[PDB]
């Protein structure tokens, strides 16, 4: 339910040019309702999200690139 | 004339067949990693080293 | 996780969860006879556009907030 409400708020932001203030709506886990996280003072460095996407994508791509595994038995 | 050399020994034919079977097995093993749509392989050594 | 810890210092739990979710959903497409090269190409384009969208619509300049943003950013962490 929360993600559906959270997604609905952000959907209106990208389709209604006069409702661009809804981009800041996130999650308020204390009361379990969406909340403007820019007003609430919930901030993260931009580098944290950007580097998370770049690193996770490359790591996921690396594993996705495998389709065959050969495990040599130990020499001992 | 008719019949030629008997070729009593059968070992050379078996050796040739085994060599060909091994080569074909290797080729089929590495066929999947050919071309732009080929895919990598992950090889883990006895020491535990992992290479993709 | 170590790389994110060394090069950023935060978001270490998020990157592991996101990467596993990315791989989990990618495999579902592969099981539907979608070639992994197509899936990899889609992921690369999405990651490039996600970064561009963030830097163009979801960034807040800290100069408009003063010292309070640093406290709020620290409190969030
Ligand atoms: N006060 C808060 N209200 C709502 N969400 C928050 C709050 N503080 C942090 N979060 C969110 O919780 C998520 C988890 O962060 P956390 O797991 O603590 O960082 P890390 O992944 O480095 O351990 C963050 O993405 C952040 O957006
Ligand atoms: Mg954290």
mmCIF file with all atom_site columns, N, CA, C and O in Angstrom, chain B residues 18-45:
data_model
loop_
_atom_site.group_PDB
_atom_site.id
_atom_site.type_symbol
_atom_site.label_atom_id
_atom_site.label_alt_id
_atom_site.label_comp_id
_atom_site.label_asym_id
_atom_site.label_entity_id
_atom_site.label_seq_id
_atom_site.pdbx_PDB_ins_code
_atom_site.Cartn_x
_atom_site.Cartn_y
_atom_site.Cartn_z
_atom_site.occupancy
_atom_site.B_iso_or_equiv
_atom_site.pdbx_formal_charge
_atom_site.auth_seq_id
_atom_site.auth_comp_id
_atom_site.auth_asym_id
_atom_site.auth_atom_id
_atom_site.pdbx_PDB_model_num
ATOM 1   N N  . UNK B 1 18 ? 39.291 -41.810 -30.358 1.00 0.00 ? 18 UNK B N  1
ATOM 2   C CA . UNK B 1 18 ? 39.326 -41.161 -29.050 1.00 0.00 ? 18 UNK B CA 1
ATOM 3   C C  . UNK B 1 18 ? 39.878 -39.744 -29.147 1.00 0.00 ? 18 UNK B C  1
ATOM 4   O O  . UNK B 1 18 ? 39.359 -38.823 -28.501 1.00 0.00 ? 18 UNK B O  1
ATOM 5   N N  . UNK B 1 19 ? 40.933 -39.549 -29.943 1.00 0.00 ? 19 UNK B N  1
ATOM 6   C CA . UNK B 1 19 ? 41.484 -38.210 -30.122 1.00 0.00 ? 19 UNK B CA 1
ATOM 7   C C  . UNK B 1 19 ? 40.444 -37.275 -30.724 1.00 0.00 ? 19 UNK B C  1
ATOM 8   O O  . UNK B 1 19 ? 40.268 -36.135 -30.268 1.00 0.00 ? 19 UNK B O  1
ATOM 9   N N  . UNK B 1 20 ? 39.732 -37.752 -31.746 1.00 0.00 ? 20 UNK B N  1
ATOM 10  C CA . UNK B 1 20 ? 38.715 -36.922 -32.378 1.00 0.00 ? 20 UNK B CA 1
ATOM 11  C C  . UNK B 1 20 ? 37.592 -36.615 -31.399 1.00 0.00 ? 20 UNK B C  1
ATOM 12  O O  . UNK B 1 20 ? 37.072 -35.495 -31.362 1.00 0.00 ? 20 UNK B O  1
ATOM 13  N N  . UNK B 1 21 ? 37.185 -37.607 -30.605 1.00 0.00 ? 21 UNK B N  1
ATOM 14  C CA . UNK B 1 21 ? 36.119 -37.382 -29.637 1.00 0.00 ? 21 UNK B CA 1
ATOM 15  C C  . UNK B 1 21 ? 36.517 -36.323 -28.621 1.00 0.00 ? 21 UNK B C  1
ATOM 16  O O  . UNK B 1 21 ? 35.715 -35.446 -28.283 1.00 0.00 ? 21 UNK B O  1
ATOM 17  N N  . UNK B 1 22 ? 37.757 -36.379 -28.132 1.00 0.00 ? 22 UNK B N  1
ATOM 18  C CA . UNK B 1 22 ? 38.212 -35.372 -27.178 1.00 0.00 ? 22 UNK B CA 1
ATOM 19  C C  . UNK B 1 22 ? 38.240 -33.983 -27.806 1.00 0.00 ? 22 UNK B C  1
ATOM 20  O O  . UNK B 1 22 ? 37.795 -33.001 -27.191 1.00 0.00 ? 22 UNK B O  1
ATOM 21  N N  . UNK B 1 23 ? 38.758 -33.876 -29.032 1.00 0.00 ? 23 UNK B N  1
ATOM 22  C CA . UNK B 1 23 ? 38.810 -32.573 -29.690 1.00 0.00 ? 23 UNK B CA 1
ATOM 23  C C  . UNK B 1 23 ? 37.411 -32.016 -29.927 1.00 0.00 ? 23 UNK B C  1
ATOM 24  O O  . UNK B 1 23 ? 37.160 -30.824 -29.706 1.00 0.00 ? 23 UNK B O  1
ATOM 25  N N  . UNK B 1 24 ? 36.488 -32.866 -30.377 1.00 0.00 ? 24 UNK B N  1
ATOM 26  C CA . UNK B 1 24 ? 35.115 -32.432 -30.600 1.00 0.00 ? 24 UNK B CA 1
ATOM 27  C C  . UNK B 1 24 ? 34.454 -32.012 -29.296 1.00 0.00 ? 24 UNK B C  1
ATOM 28  O O  . UNK B 1 24 ? 33.678 -31.051 -29.267 1.00 0.00 ? 24 UNK B O  1
ATOM 29  N N  . UNK B 1 25 ? 34.743 -32.726 -28.206 1.00 0.00 ? 25 UNK B N  1
ATOM 30  C CA . UNK B 1 25 ? 34.192 -32.348 -26.910 1.00 0.00 ? 25 UNK B CA 1
ATOM 31  C C  . UNK B 1 25 ? 34.683 -30.971 -26.486 1.00 0.00 ? 25 UNK B C  1
ATOM 32  O O  . UNK B 1 25 ? 33.901 -30.152 -25.993 1.00 0.00 ? 25 UNK B O  1
ATOM 33  N N  . UNK B 1 26 ? 35.974 -30.694 -26.680 1.00 0.00 ? 26 UNK B N  1
ATOM 34  C CA . UNK B 1 26 ? 36.504 -29.378 -26.327 1.00 0.00 ? 26 UNK B CA 1
ATOM 35  C C  . UNK B 1 26 ? 35.860 -28.292 -27.182 1.00 0.00 ? 26 UNK B C  1
ATOM 36  O O  . UNK B 1 26 ? 35.465 -27.225 -26.679 1.00 0.00 ? 26 UNK B O  1
ATOM 37  N N  . UNK B 1 27 ? 35.743 -28.544 -28.489 1.00 0.00 ? 27 UNK B N  1
ATOM 38  C CA . UNK B 1 27 ? 35.137 -27.558 -29.377 1.00 0.00 ? 27 UNK B CA 1
ATOM 39  C C  . UNK B 1 27 ? 33.691 -27.280 -28.988 1.00 0.00 ? 27 UNK B C  1
ATOM 40  O O  . UNK B 1 27 ? 33.264 -26.121 -28.954 1.00 0.00 ? 27 UNK B O  1
ATOM 41  N N  . UNK B 1 28 ? 32.926 -28.329 -28.682 1.00 0.00 ? 28 UNK B N  1
ATOM 42  C CA . UNK B 1 28 ? 31.544 -28.138 -28.261 1.00 0.00 ? 28 UNK B CA 1
ATOM 43  C C  . UNK B 1 28 ? 31.464 -27.415 -26.925 1.00 0.00 ? 28 UNK B C  1
ATOM 44  O O  . UNK B 1 28 ? 30.537 -26.629 -26.701 1.00 0.00 ? 28 UNK B O  1
ATOM 45  N N  . UNK B 1 29 ? 32.414 -27.674 -26.025 1.00 0.00 ? 29 UNK B N  1
ATOM 46  C CA . UNK B 1 29 ? 32.423 -26.982 -24.743 1.00 0.00 ? 29 UNK B CA 1
ATOM 47  C C  . UNK B 1 29 ? 32.619 -25.485 -24.926 1.00 0.00 ? 29 UNK B C  1
ATOM 48  O O  . UNK B 1 29 ? 31.960 -24.681 -24.256 1.00 0.00 ? 29 UNK B O  1
ATOM 49  N N  . UNK B 1 30 ? 33.518 -25.084 -25.831 1.00 0.00 ? 30 UNK B N  1
ATOM 50  C CA . UNK B 1 30 ? 33.800 -23.657 -25.986 1.00 0.00 ? 30 UNK B CA 1
ATOM 51  C C  . UNK B 1 30 ? 32.976 -22.995 -27.084 1.00 0.00 ? 30 UNK B C  1
ATOM 52  O O  . UNK B 1 30 ? 33.139 -21.791 -27.319 1.00 0.00 ? 30 UNK B O  1
ATOM 53  N N  . UNK B 1 31 ? 32.104 -23.738 -27.770 1.00 0.00 ? 31 UNK B N  1
ATOM 54  C CA . UNK B 1 31 ? 31.287 -23.130 -28.818 1.00 0.00 ? 31 UNK B CA 1
ATOM 55  C C  . UNK B 1 31 ? 30.370 -22.038 -28.282 1.00 0.00 ? 31 UNK B C  1
ATOM 56  O O  . UNK B 1 31 ? 30.103 -21.055 -28.983 1.00 0.00 ? 31 UNK B O  1
ATOM 57  N N  . UNK B 1 32 ? 29.874 -22.187 -27.053 1.00 0.00 ? 32 UNK B N  1
ATOM 58  C CA . UNK B 1 32 ? 28.875 -21.260 -26.534 1.00 0.00 ? 32 UNK B CA 1
ATOM 59  C C  . UNK B 1 32 ? 29.423 -19.850 -26.347 1.00 0.00 ? 32 UNK B C  1
ATOM 60  O O  . UNK B 1 32 ? 28.642 -18.897 -26.257 1.00 0.00 ? 32 UNK B O  1
ATOM 61  N N  . UNK B 1 33 ? 30.743 -19.688 -26.309 1.00 0.00 ? 33 UNK B N  1
ATOM 62  C CA . UNK B 1 33 ? 31.374 -18.396 -26.049 1.00 0.00 ? 33 UNK B CA 1
ATOM 63  C C  . UNK B 1 33 ? 31.914 -17.753 -27.320 1.00 0.00 ? 33 UNK B C  1
ATOM 64  O O  . UNK B 1 33 ? 32.981 -17.133 -27.304 1.00 0.00 ? 33 UNK B O  1
ATOM 65  N N  . UNK B 1 34 ? 31.199 -17.880 -28.433 1.00 0.00 ? 34 UNK B N  1
ATOM 66  C CA . UNK B 1 34 ? 31.645 -17.372 -29.723 1.00 0.00 ? 34 UNK B CA 1
ATOM 67  C C  . UNK B 1 34 ? 30.702 -16.282 -30.211 1.00 0.00 ? 34 UNK B C  1
ATOM 68  O O  . UNK B 1 34 ? 29.478 -16.431 -30.128 1.00 0.00 ? 34 UNK B O  1
ATOM 69  N N  . UNK B 1 35 ? 31.271 -15.194 -30.722 1.00 0.00 ? 35 UNK B N  1
ATOM 70  C CA . UNK B 1 35 ? 30.497 -14.148 -31.346 1.00 0.00 ? 35 UNK B CA 1
ATOM 71  C C  . UNK B 1 35 ? 30.015 -13.094 -30.373 1.00 0.00 ? 35 UNK B C  1
ATOM 72  O O  . UNK B 1 35 ? 30.185 -13.209 -29.157 1.00 0.00 ? 35 UNK B O  1
ATOM 73  N N  . UNK B 1 36 ? 29.393 -12.038 -30.903 1.00 0.00 ? 36 UNK B N  1
ATOM 74  C CA . UNK B 1 36 ? 28.894 -10.969 -30.025 1.00 0.00 ? 36 UNK B CA 1
ATOM 75  C C  . UNK B 1 36 ? 27.827 -11.439 -29.058 1.00 0.00 ? 36 UNK B C  1
ATOM 76  O O  . UNK B 1 36 ? 27.644 -10.826 -28.000 1.00 0.00 ? 36 UNK B O  1
ATOM 77  N N  . UNK B 1 37 ? 27.112 -12.510 -29.390 1.00 0.00 ? 37 UNK B N  1
ATOM 78  C CA . UNK B 1 37 ? 26.129 -13.102 -28.497 1.00 0.00 ? 37 UNK B CA 1
ATOM 79  C C  . UNK B 1 37 ? 26.713 -14.214 -27.639 1.00 0.00 ? 37 UNK B C  1
ATOM 80  O O  . UNK B 1 37 ? 25.968 -14.876 -26.912 1.00 0.00 ? 37 UNK B O  1
ATOM 81  N N  . UNK B 1 38 ? 28.021 -14.438 -27.714 1.00 0.00 ? 38 UNK B N  1
ATOM 82  C CA . UNK B 1 38 ? 28.655 -15.383 -26.825 1.00 0.00 ? 38 UNK B CA 1
ATOM 83  C C  . UNK B 1 38 ? 28.667 -14.897 -25.389 1.00 0.00 ? 38 UNK B C  1
ATOM 84  O O  . UNK B 1 38 ? 28.543 -13.707 -25.095 1.00 0.00 ? 38 UNK B O  1
ATOM 85  N N  . UNK B 1 39 ? 28.830 -15.851 -24.476 1.00 0.00 ? 39 UNK B N  1
ATOM 86  C CA . UNK B 1 39 ? 28.729 -15.583 -23.053 1.00 0.00 ? 39 UNK B CA 1
ATOM 87  C C  . UNK B 1 39 ? 29.963 -16.122 -22.345 1.00 0.00 ? 39 UNK B C  1
ATOM 88  O O  . UNK B 1 39 ? 30.571 -17.100 -22.787 1.00 0.00 ? 39 UNK B O  1
ATOM 89  N N  . UNK B 1 40 ? 30.324 -15.480 -21.239 1.00 0.00 ? 40 UNK B N  1
ATOM 90  C CA . UNK B 1 40 ? 31.554 -15.807 -20.539 1.00 0.00 ? 40 UNK B CA 1
ATOM 91  C C  . UNK B 1 40 ? 31.400 -17.091 -19.727 1.00 0.00 ? 40 UNK B C  1
ATOM 92  O O  . UNK B 1 40 ? 30.301 -17.617 -19.539 1.00 0.00 ? 40 UNK B O  1
ATOM 93  N N  . UNK B 1 41 ? 32.534 -17.594 -19.249 1.00 0.00 ? 41 UNK B N  1
ATOM 94  C CA . UNK B 1 41 ? 32.589 -18.768 -18.391 1.00 0.00 ? 41 UNK B CA 1
ATOM 95  C C  . UNK B 1 41 ? 33.339 -18.426 -17.115 1.00 0.00 ? 41 UNK B C  1
ATOM 96  O O  . UNK B 1 41 ? 34.302 -17.655 -17.138 1.00 0.00 ? 41 UNK B O  1
ATOM 97  N N  . UNK B 1 42 ? 32.899 -19.006 -16.005 1.00 0.00 ? 42 UNK B N  1
ATOM 98  C CA . UNK B 1 42 ? 33.539 -18.820 -14.711 1.00 0.00 ? 42 UNK B CA 1
ATOM 99  C C  . UNK B 1 42 ? 34.294 -20.092 -14.360 1.00 0.00 ? 42 UNK B C  1
ATOM 100 O O  . UNK B 1 42 ? 33.697 -21.170 -14.283 1.00 0.00 ? 42 UNK B O  1
ATOM 101 N N  . UNK B 1 43 ? 35.599 -19.964 -14.143 1.00 0.00 ? 43 UNK B N  1
ATOM 102 C CA . UNK B 1 43 ? 36.475 -21.100 -13.888 1.00 0.00 ? 43 UNK B CA 1
ATOM 103 C C  . UNK B 1 43 ? 37.091 -20.921 -12.509 1.00 0.00 ? 43 UNK B C  1
ATOM 104 O O  . UNK B 1 43 ? 37.725 -19.894 -12.236 1.00 0.00 ? 43 UNK B O  1
ATOM 105 N N  . UNK B 1 44 ? 36.909 -21.916 -11.647 1.00 0.00 ? 44 UNK B N  1
ATOM 106 C CA . UNK B 1 44 ? 37.429 -21.894 -10.287 1.00 0.00 ? 44 UNK B CA 1
ATOM 107 C C  . UNK B 1 44 ? 38.546 -22.921 -10.172 1.00 0.00 ? 44 UNK B C  1
ATOM 108 O O  . UNK B 1 44 ? 38.320 -24.116 -10.392 1.00 0.00 ? 44 UNK B O  1
ATOM 109 N N  . UNK B 1 45 ? 39.742 -22.456 -9.826  1.00 0.00 ? 45 UNK B N  1
ATOM 110 C CA . UNK B 1 45 ? 40.901 -23.330 -9.734  1.00 0.00 ? 45 UNK B CA 1
ATOM 111 C C  . UNK B 1 45 ? 40.821 -24.191 -8.476  1.00 0.00 ? 45 UNK B C  1
ATOM 112 O O  . UNK B 1 45 ? 39.941 -24.030 -7.626  1.00 0.00 ? 45 UNK B O  1
#
